[PDB]
Amino acid sequence: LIPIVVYDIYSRLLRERIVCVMGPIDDSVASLVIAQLLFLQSESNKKPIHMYINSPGGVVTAGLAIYDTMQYILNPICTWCVGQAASMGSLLLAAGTPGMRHSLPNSRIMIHQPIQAEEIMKLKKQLYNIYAKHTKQSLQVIESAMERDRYMSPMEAQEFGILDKVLVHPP
Amino acid sequence: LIPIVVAYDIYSRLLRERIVCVMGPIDDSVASLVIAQLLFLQSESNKKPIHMYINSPGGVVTAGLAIYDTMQYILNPICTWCVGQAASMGSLLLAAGTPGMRHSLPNSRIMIHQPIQAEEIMKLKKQLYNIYAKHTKQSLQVIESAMERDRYMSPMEAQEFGILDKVLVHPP
Amino acid sequence: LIPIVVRAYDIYSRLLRERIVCVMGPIDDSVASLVIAQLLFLQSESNKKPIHMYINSPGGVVTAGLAIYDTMQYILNPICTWCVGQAASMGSLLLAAGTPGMRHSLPNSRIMIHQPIQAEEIMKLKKQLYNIYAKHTKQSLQVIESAMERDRYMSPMEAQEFGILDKVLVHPP
Amino acid sequence: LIPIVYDIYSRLLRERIVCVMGPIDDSVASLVIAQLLFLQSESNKKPIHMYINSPGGVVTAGLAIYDTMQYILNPICTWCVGQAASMGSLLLAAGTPGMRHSLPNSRIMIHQPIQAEEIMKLKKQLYNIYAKHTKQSLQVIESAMERDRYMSPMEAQEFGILDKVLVHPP
Amino acid sequence: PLIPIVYDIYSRLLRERIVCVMGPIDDSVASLVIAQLLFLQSESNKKPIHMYINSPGGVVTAGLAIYDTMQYILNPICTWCVGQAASMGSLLLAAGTPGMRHSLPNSRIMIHQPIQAEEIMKLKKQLYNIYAKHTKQSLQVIESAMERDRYMSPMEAQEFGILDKVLVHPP
Amino acid sequence: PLIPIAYDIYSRLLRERIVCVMGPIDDSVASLVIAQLLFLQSESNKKPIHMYINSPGGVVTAGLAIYDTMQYILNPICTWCVGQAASMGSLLLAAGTPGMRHSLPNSRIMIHQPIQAEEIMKLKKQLYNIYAKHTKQSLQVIESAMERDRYMSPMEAQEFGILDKVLVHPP
Amino acid sequence: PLIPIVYDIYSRLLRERIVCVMGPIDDSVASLVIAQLLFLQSESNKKPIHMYINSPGGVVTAGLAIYDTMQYILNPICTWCVGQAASMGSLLLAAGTPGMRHSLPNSRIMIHQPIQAEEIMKLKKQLYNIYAKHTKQSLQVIESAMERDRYMSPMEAQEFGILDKVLVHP
Amino acid sequence: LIPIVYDIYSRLLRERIVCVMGPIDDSVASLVIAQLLFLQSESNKKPIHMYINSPGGVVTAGLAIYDTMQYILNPICTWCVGQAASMGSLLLAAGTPGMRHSLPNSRIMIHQPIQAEEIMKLKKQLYNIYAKHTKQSLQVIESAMERDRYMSPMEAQEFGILDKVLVHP
Amino acid sequence: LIPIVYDIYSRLLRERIVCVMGPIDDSVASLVIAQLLFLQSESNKKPIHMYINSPGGVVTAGLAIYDTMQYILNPICTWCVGQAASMGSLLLAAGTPGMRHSLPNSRIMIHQPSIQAEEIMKLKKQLYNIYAKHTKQSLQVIESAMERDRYMSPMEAQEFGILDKVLVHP
Ligand SMILES: CC[C@H](C)[C@H]1C(=O)N(Cc2cccc3ccccc23)C[C@@H]2N(C(=O)NCCCC(F)(F)F)CCC(=O)N12
Ligand SMILES: CC[C@H](C)[C@H]1C(=O)N(Cc2cccc3ccccc23)C[C@@H]2N(C(=O)NCCCC(F)(F)F)CCC(=O)N12
Ligand SMILES: CC[C@H](C)[C@H]1C(=O)N(Cc2cccc3ccccc23)C[C@@H]2N(C(=O)NCCCC(F)(F)F)CCC(=O)N12
Ligand SMILES: CC[C@H](C)[C@H]1C(=O)N(Cc2cccc3ccccc23)C[C@@H]2N(C(=O)NCCCC(F)(F)F)CCC(=O)N12
Ligand SMILES: CC[C@H](C)[C@H]1C(=O)N(Cc2cccc3ccccc23)C[C@@H]2N(C(=O)NCCCC(F)(F)F)CCC(=O)N12
Ligand SMILES: CC[C@H](C)[C@H]1C(=O)N(Cc2cccc3ccccc23)C[C@@H]2N(C(=O)NCCCC(F)(F)F)CCC(=O)N12
Ligand SMILES: CC[C@H](C)[C@H]1C(=O)N(Cc2cccc3ccccc23)C[C@@H]2N(C(=O)NCCCC(F)(F)F)CCC(=O)N12
Ligand SMILES: CC[C@H](C)[C@H]1C(=O)N(Cc2cccc3ccccc23)C[C@@H]2N(C(=O)NCCCC(F)(F)F)CCC(=O)N12
Ligand SMILES: CC[C@H](C)[C@H]1C(=O)N(Cc2cccc3ccccc23)C[C@@H]2N(C(=O)NCCCC(F)(F)F)CCC(=O)N12
Ligand SMILES: [Mg+2]
């Protein structure tokens, strides 16, 4: 049951420029997030957008659709990891505007990922290049890390280049 | 949960700005909704461009062709935008946008390969060959060869092939 | 999800205000009743102004198709039929039943008159279909019978030659 | 089942009461977090009341709510009615000091009913959070969490999970 | 349903030339019955075969397959209606050797029948001709009777030409 | 569904060189029929094999597997249509040894048929050539007939070249 | 599906050195085929083994398990395609003893293929090398052909090196 | 349908071949253990051949088979055909030294696809078993088991999981 | 698929080995009890071997097997392979003193995972008394240990009195 304010709660957050990326990312979630990003951009192409991320991952092309839209719009995008960002969720976290990528202290971050053979490898290489661009790590290090079935703490994710700030309280 | 803006749900709000969404598998229900939206936008103005957002793995051939024919029939220019993917019938719709107005974002994947009686399935397949030839400007022989290859193309390859005009990282 | 336009219409209701009725998907009793109710509404708004009938359907229940057919004939309005995607089985009967001169298809549509209760009753219904197609296409009963046994689709051009429709348009005239 | 006019829960939300009920998963956590952000923007000083009746749920979803409670500036009064087990008892214990309550017949459990290394890392995060808010040593928290049992409100007060056991308002 | 052994009980009855046509008649039942008729014929093409019929009907082509095999073999076939013979069941009852078609006293018999249109009519006309042949009634009378949704007593079925003898006790 | 004796009636028929092709033809049915044809062949490569066919059709490649095995073995094969032979069932009926293709009088026979596009057409053309070979009709006539959604009587199927003899009683 | 007896019919065929590879190839099918190959080898390591193949394909590692066992045993193995051999089925067909790979005239043969990303590519490359070895075609030609979604006639498969003989009669 | 000659697996059992196929659960473990006890009583000296084609399964069921292999006196030749992942690769590695084999196209994975403390205790038992049979350090075993990947037979030989990669006898 | 030699379990039964595997319900208990009666009538002196690999099960079904083990005159050697949890560990502990074994990697749990309230407590107290009798620990220590949600290694189970011998080899 989604509560209302006199607007359902998510719509109310949307009016304050907060977009929620929650649960598994599929085509339906991607389209909704993209539609919300277009809406916020037309209200103002300068004011920051806040992206709340609590997700175990999802479909690669759906994640990439959101990724490309984030890059395409002019707005700065602050990413916030609460709970977890695994697989495509961690890619979206890392794709926030430099300096504006955040996690709360107990979140868990995973870049490991839990079609023809050639196509699955082409998509995998696209992920390598995107993580390399945003984290500043080499392709070899990205590949090694993505093969490891383990989560990182927020501090480790900061050291790796996935995020900028680990906040307990506002600054 | 579909979010609302103030009462419009997010897609209806996009529709008021002349953006139509073609998302997920294309069946008769999706085709009818898209067609109804195209008729609405045309009556508001038969000159102002229409934006078509495409993120689809494909679908039913006749439903795809219904949308295709309606796109051609209306007078408006139609800008097509590939985000995520356009496979099978999705890539046909992408290619059918107004010349010069067919776009993809940088990490999209495009497939023209295709994943009721035998004679009828071949007749539909030949209709697809002729439509791709018209809009890509490639020969029928090249279309037939390419459609037999089970693979995706990058946006740059799709541009070289004639499926789209522009690969944009940021607006122009 | 059906989109809305603003004073709140869903998109099909908005099309209905412009005299467009949609016959989409399989035709059953529920679809027939909705289409019939819409035809009665449009008639009372004006019994002279044309009605546009959008048809994209693989067919359906014979008596439900016949209910829509009879209502189309009964109202006074001219009815323009438009085949987009496909009109198979009962869908092609409705297409053929539009006002003469006002039956249209877009260029890539597919049209089928082949059809994919006690034995005597199924034959009686089949003969009613033969007579309706004969009336509207102007073909003989023998030719209708032969054609309906062939499991195939027709292009819009072939359907025009056969008498199912009048005009194949790429763009408005 | 939900009575109308605007449902009862939205009406409670207008009085700064947030409900954490049933199993805690990602969907529940997101709703609770969204409500906490709403109440904070209405006023970052006025207290928030958190009603907790829950058998527990997903660890990361519980931790997401925990972190948001700490992050906002408001004081948060926690109220245990019925039960607070597993992640539910962590949220109860995480209320503002002096403002953690239970009604008299509630049951409280800190026992907990992914790769091996990851389940242990999450378990150690829970140990440190309970130690911080209860003021008990890590060794005592670990021992208590291995015992499959519930505590009465009085026992939970003695342990440091809550501050007040009320039969009637003060 | 546990089948008792002595051979299972149906196999034991088969060794004494008794074939059972029970329940709905589909392709599987028809094949079984046909296989049994071929077996009994090879043991002796002169000795009578007893066919026990208790059936609400079934698939027309499967019924016709059994019918044609009954006619094809040389043996006399005694048909016995116990419980009921409806639709295709009553056709098989009527198709027994003349003089050898029986019912017990409380059985119920129905000739009413509870693919493209043209094909269903062609099959229906094949049924008309078969009933006319074995009952000795006109085609017009068969067609009228088959439109009536009702059962007949054994005595009425005897008068109509579906069977020869209604026995309470052996003769 | 209970077969009678375990040593069922179908195995007993197999010992007399009768193979049953019943119900929908899929890979499992084709393999069983093929295995039985190999068995009968090794018992004697001269003695005829009887193939009982009551089938609404099935998978094209499974039908073709049985077809090719029938041609490959050296035995004469008598085909018998009881009930119906539709789609791939009618192909098997037509593929019996010339002069040895039979139907009982009330059977129904259909040649109409109720993967990439190019592949479905290649298989369809293989069916055209097989029917042309065994019926002696032209490719154009086969193609026209297979588009018509209808059944044929045994007499019509005889005239068309699908079978040789329509028997009410043995010769 | 009732299996007839004489021995069930497949066991009877096994006594004449005929092994059946039918339907989708999974771990259960592979283990049965492997067990049968070990049995026939111990009866005689010289007498040929006949392998009947009618299969749309299946699990790659299960197909490779059968492949490796075929190579490992000393017996000559005659492969017979009836109906179809697609994906892993066509690999087994091609892996028969040279000169002893057969198809009946109306069979259809497909080498196109209808886990982490790196692992699926490693398995795909193992398939390329196996087809190259047994067909005598270059790796580049195998890779190009496997990307085309289409079937080959028995004659085309013979020309390609997948089989040696297309027989209408024994 | 399992063919008869004995069903085919029973026939292989009479030649001292035991099959460990598909997912390993309690039912599979009990059957394998029962077969190992049978073969041991026929002769406690003659080798036993263990065919392994398995994606893994339940840890305690794998450990039950492991302990029984060690407990009996017989030499045990392990054979990887198709794959040995997770608990399957542990059983492969637990064969008698010098008698651990793979065919050339097999895939081998030591990565693994109840309370928190208990899952770690079981994990540490696996670390010590792999260390014993491969001769690698505990630190290297731990690192390798976190990597979600398969090894070729040659890599598995270099790592100490098996002794011989044979194309032909 | 159960192999034949007798199916393999029946063959083991002829050598006085009874298998208690998987979840223990009424059906399993009745089969085990029937086997114990059979072995007893063959000889009331010769030992019986009980193989235990079980996560637990229904309390009354476990108690039925327990009572029958005590009732017959034979010595009973218990063998834990894989695991013995809940009712499984009770049966392990109930073997003849000196004849209770585990292999080295087994896991043993006496905690119960996760009828009127009074009845569930009566059954729980029956378990306390049975464990006290066979382990020789005080009932207070049994009750405390059974509240801890954890497994024991074979060595710890030996120290606790659950079993007598941890063997790597005969
Ligand atoms: C960043 C958007 C730029 C400026 C631009 C443009 O690139 N596209 C194409 C487009 C179309 C569809 C999906 C897309 C997804 C990602 C990127 C581009 C997409 C349409 C958009 N429009 C709106 O946003 N209109 C107002 C939005 C308010 C609303 F309420 F509708 F949300 C129409 C006017 C327009 O110029 N653009
Ligand atoms: C391109 C449409 C042209 C101009 C034309 C015409 O071809 N058709 C027929 C038609 C009917 C039904 C479905 C069709 C699908 C594809 C193409 C044509 C279809 C109806 C339309 N009308 C409306 O659009 N009316 C306003 C509708 C929009 C709104 F939502 F706003 F109400 C009525 C005035 C009219 O003649 N035409
Ligand atoms: C062609 C309709 C004529 C004129 C006539 C008539 O035959 N019937 C009977 C009738 C009843 C019900 C279903 C029918 C289906 C098919 C044919 C006739 C049916 C009702 C109709 N009415 C309306 O439609 N009234 C306006 C309603 C407008 C609204 F907006 F509400 F839809 C009431 C005035 C009236 O006498 N007739
Ligand atoms: C404690 C929140 C601080 C103050 C701060 C901030 O860090 N985030 C980031 C953020 C984003 C998304 C999820 C988060 C979860 C936990 C913590 C931070 C999260 C958004 C917030 N905003 C609002 O809530 N604005 C008022 C609107 C609230 C209402 F519900 F009414 F819409 C936008 C301006 C702003 O400063 N912040
Ligand atoms: C009445 C049967 C006649 C005499 C004749 C004949 O037409 N067919 C063909 C046939 C084949 C298959 C199904 C048929 C169905 C209906 C009619 C004929 C059918 C087989 C039979 N055979 C047996 O039954 N042989 C003895 C076997 C006895 C057994 F116990 F096994 F059933 C083979 C030798 C033979 O001459 N015929
Ligand atoms: C007509 C078959 C010829 C003669 C020949 C041959 O082509 N194959 C290959 C083959 C193998 C597998 C499936 C096949 C399907 C279609 C065609 C050929 C097939 C094996 C057969 N054998 C048997 O049938 N042996 C008798 C055993 C029969 C029984 F059931 F009783 F066990 C082994 C000796 C032999 O020469 N051939
Ligand atoms: C080609 C097998 C060779 C010759 C060799 C050998 O490598 N293995 C190991 C082995 C074990 C298990 C699966 C295997 C799969 C593929 C390859 C090897 C496999 C067992 C076999 N044995 C038997 O087959 N014994 C007779 C069995 C006959 C029966 F009828 F029972 F099946 C035992 C002694 C022996 O020399 N080998
Ligand atoms: C290697 C077993 C040793 C030698 C010894 C022993 O430790 N156990 C205990 C035991 C019991 C139950 C399961 C066990 C699982 C793993 C390890 C030990 C197990 C019983 C076994 N027996 C048999 O195997 N008997 C022959 C069986 C032959 C048959 F054909 F039936 F399978 C009874 C005579 C005997 O000395 N032992
Ligand atoms: C420990 C059993 C004692 C000795 C005694 C006795 O108490 N009961 C009663 C009884 C009955 C049923 C279940 C029981 C379960 C637990 C305890 C007692 C049970 C029957 C048994 N009998 C057998 O076992 N007879 C030989 C059996 C041979 C067979 F192979 F079939 F098992 C009949 C003669 C007899 O003296 N008793
Ligand atoms: Mg005793």
Residue numbers in the entry:
A (entry chain D): 58 to 63, 73 to 180, 193 to 249
B (entry chain E): 58 to 63, 72 to 180, 193 to 249
C (entry chain F): 58 to 63, 71 to 180, 193 to 249
D (entry chain C): 58 to 62, 73 to 180, 193 to 249
E (entry chain J): 57 to 62, 73 to 180, 193 to 249
F (entry chain K): 57 to 61, 72 to 180, 193 to 249
G (entry chain L): 57 to 62, 73 to 180, 193 to 248
H (entry chain M): 58 to 62, 73 to 180, 193 to 248
From the reporting publication:
ZG180 is more potent than ICG-001 in activating SaClpP for α-casein hydrolysis, as evidenced by a 3-fold decrease in EC50. However, ZG180 also promotes HsClpP for α-casein hydrolysis, which indicates that ZG180 is also a global activator for both bacterial and mitochondrial ClpP proteins. Either ZG180/SaClpP or ZG180/HsClpP structure is a single tetradecamer composed of two stacked heptameric rings. Like the previously characterized ClpP activators, the binding of fourteen ZG180 molecules induces an open-gated state in the tetradecameric ClpP cylinders with an enlarged axis entrance pore. The apparent electron densities in the 2fo-fc and fo-fc omit maps unambiguously demonstrate ZG180 binding on the apical surface of SaClpP and HsClpP. A similar binding manner is observed in the ZG180/HsClpP structure. While SaClpP and HsClpP share a high similarity in the primary sequences, there is a large indole motif of W146 in HsClpP but a much smaller isopropyl side chain of I91 in SaClpP in the conserved position. Indeed, structural superimposition of the ZG180/SaClpP and ZG180/HsClpP complexes also reveals that the α-carbon of the naphthyl motif in ZG180 is likely to be a discriminant site for introducing steric clash against the bulky side chain of W146 in HsClpP. To understand the structural mechanism that causes (R)- and (S)-ZG197 to selectively bind to and activate SaClpP but not HsClpP, we aligned our resolved structures of (R)-ZG197/SaClpP and (S)-ZG197/SaClpP to the ZG180/HsClpP structure. The naphthyl group in (S)-ZG197 is positioned in the opposite direction compared to that in ZG180 and (R)-ZG197, which results in a direct clash with the side chain of W146 in HsClpP.
ClpP is a highly conserved protease regulated by ATPases in bacteria and in mitochondria. In bacteria, ClpP is responsible for modulating the expression of virulence factors, antibiotic resistance, and the formation of biofilms and persisters. Likewise, Homo sapiens ClpP (HsClpP), which is found in the mitochondria, is a key protease regulating mitochondrial proteins homeostasis. The dysfunction of ClpP by small molecule activators has recently been demonstrated to be a possible method of discovering antibacterial and anticancer drugs.
